[PDB]
Design a binder for this molecule. Structure first.
Ligand SMILES: NS(=O)(=O)c1ccc(NC(=O)Nc2ccc(F)cc2)cc1
Ligand SMILES: NS(=O)(=O)c1ccc(NC(=O)Nc2ccc(F)cc2)cc1
Ligand SMILES: *[C@@H]1O[C@H](CO)[C@@H](O)[C@H](O)[C@H]1NC(C)=O
Ligand SMILES: *[C@@H]1O[C@H](CO)[C@@H](O)[C@H](O)[C@H]1NC(C)=O
Ligand SMILES: *[C@@H]1O[C@H](CO)[C@@H](O)[C@H](O)[C@H]1NC(C)=O
Ligand SMILES: *[C@@H]1O[C@H](CO)[C@@H](O)[C@H](O)[C@H]1NC(C)=O
Ligand SMILES: *[C@@H]1O[C@H](CO)[C@@H](O)[C@H](O)[C@H]1NC(C)=O
Ligand SMILES: [Zn+2]
Lengths: 277, 277
């Protein structure tokens, strides 16, 4: 069993309860340090694209730790190389947020926390035929991190919730774990257009929940998408699962890990991308 | 379904036959370039050590593609950190060699091929309770590469074959795949004493046979251990398995892979270690 807020099963214990791989030295999240990172001009614009033949439904679940969108198979894809040949297939999207507006994100950018971080999870379909084959295997996953920031003055249509279609109104106090509901499809291409998809951090890391598998190619966009206080408070209405100490879901983030803990046997490097200047 | 010397199943076909993961961009072996490597002073002396109360038998097999020593469980270990707490457990040792003395190794050092490269394969017991659990999982394996060079003048006792106890005389034309034979134990601590265990290349790579899993922590010692022409010739009497074109086992090495093929989404770095000096 694991939690965020029960000190007995909480993040400080994962290294002992899930040594494979929460005890590793390629863990996530990390502080994304603009100064320390290596600018790699070969890293291209990220594209998110849909199969316009797909008609299957999208669902969202309160899994007791997060709000998790589950996408249908063969619907949403990532391209890192400009070809639309289905190398990365999107499986789900989940969120991490704070009890308060000054924290919530798992990654930090130069020490700064955002109120809400979204994780678009994909598998390397180029190599693995199914999500369940990729999830536990080397190099199986690529995750996109989308930072969200609160603004006071904005039209609904320019907020991230327009891409999310408000999650069909499911973010409320009655959305109890482990309830799942059908929702309107998420326009992930619109979501990505709300930020600069050429401007990102890139590194090799891990899942941020047990078992913290070190098979994630991370991409974290530097520019946030925009939301309102009203929208962040919808997430804060969700109840935590019964194994949490806190009642309302919030502070569902993992503490910062080092890029290179002292025990590492082969240092990793944090990379940075920016547009063909 | 794979070979070294049959053009239908040979190394040029593995990226097609075993896309997961022989098509990847973290492949082994690589050219170990002294000038284009990063010195990491934190990388410590390698220690190999035995459980003195283990009594189980060692075997060697002609598996049709290499000579493979199979160690009993819970017997031989590697420490990278100076602690003897069974973080890495040795499973097996296999050999790669050439038809001729000018080639054989998988790795090169500044483009130089050695006549014989030994691979001491361990699983990360720190995280994974068994080899079968580790071999397919992220960060599962650590392999030591031992280069061997031929000298004309040496006492048997100062050759690598002293540490191998001459493979108990088992190596001949009759040692046919998939036969195994019980052998006297390999003194891997003696073997490591024959080179400088502080002086090595380090990088994240792959198995060098299918399915080329990208879960190997590589350590390749820069100084070779010494053998005679008679000793290399004992390997060359082994017969290849029937799916090979060549009759006698030789040239059982994979072609050199790039450190960073053009399609990489996160560059790896080659490290090197040297002594506190
Ligand atoms: N928070 S995170 O690092 O983005 C993350 C991503 C994915 C998971 N888990 C996941 O996707 N599980 C899964 C299980 C079975 C499947 F078939 C596919 C995915 C956990 C944490
Ligand atoms: N030549 S190499 O890269 O050192 C290598 C090492 C190990 C393997 N394979 C291996 O160790 N397989 C294995 C299978 C089942 C087990 F339970 C244990 C090991 C293949 C290539
Ligand atoms: C697109 O969706 C259709 C029908 O749902 C499906 O048969 C097809 O395989 C999908 N394409 C890809 C590339 O997954
Ligand atoms: C989403 O929520 C806002 C605020 O209540 C509303 O104006 C908007 O039309 C809603 N959109 C959809 C698609 O439900
Ligand atoms: C050492 O040897 C014996 C072999 O029988 C075994 O009971 C013990 O668990 C071994 N220790 C380790 C650390 O594997
Ligand atoms: C080593 O084994 C070979 C056969 O593989 C044998 O012909 C040779 O004499 C042996 N050498 C020693 C020193 O035991
Ligand atoms: C090794 O050889 C013996 C005797 O022929 C056999 O019974 C044993 O199972 C073999 N081990 C293998 C194939 O792992
Ligand atoms: Zn090998």
């Amino acid at each position: 069993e694991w939690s965020y807020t029960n000190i007995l099963t909480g993040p400080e214990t994962w290294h002992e309860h899930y040594k494979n791989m929460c005890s590793g030295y390629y863990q996530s999240p990390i502080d994304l340090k603009t100064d320390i990172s290596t600018l790699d001009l070969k890293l291209k614009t990220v594209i998110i694209y849909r199969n316009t033949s797909s008609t299957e439904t999208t669902t969202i679940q309160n899994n007791g730790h997060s709000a998790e969108v589950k996408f249908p198979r063969n619907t949403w894809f990532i391209s890192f190389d400009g070809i639309l040949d289905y190398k990365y297939e999107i499986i789900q999207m989940h969120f991490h947020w704070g009890n308060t507006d000054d924290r919530g994100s798992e990654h930090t950018i130069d020490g700064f926390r955002f109120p809400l971080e979204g994780h678009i999870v994909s598998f390397r379909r180029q190599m693995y035929s199914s999500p369940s084959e990729a999830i536990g295997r080397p190099g199986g996953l690529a995750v996109l991190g989308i930072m969200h920031q609160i603004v006071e003055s904005i039209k609904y249509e320019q907020t991230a919730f327009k891409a999310y279609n408000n999650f069909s109104g499911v973010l409320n106090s009655q959305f109890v774990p482990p309830n799942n509901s059908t929702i309107d499809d998420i326009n992930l291409a619109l979501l990505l257009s709300l930020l600069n998809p050429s401007r990102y951090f890139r590194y090799l890391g891990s899942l941020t929940t047990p078992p913290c598998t070190e098979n994630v190619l991370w991409t974290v966009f530097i520019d946030p998408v925009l939301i309102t206080r009203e929208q962040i408070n919808l997430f804060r209405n969700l109840p935590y699962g019964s194994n949490e100490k806190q009642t309302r879901m919030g502070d569902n983030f993992r503490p910062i890990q080092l890029l290179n803990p002292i025990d590492t046997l082969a240092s990793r490097t944090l990379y940075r991308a920016t547009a063909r200047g």
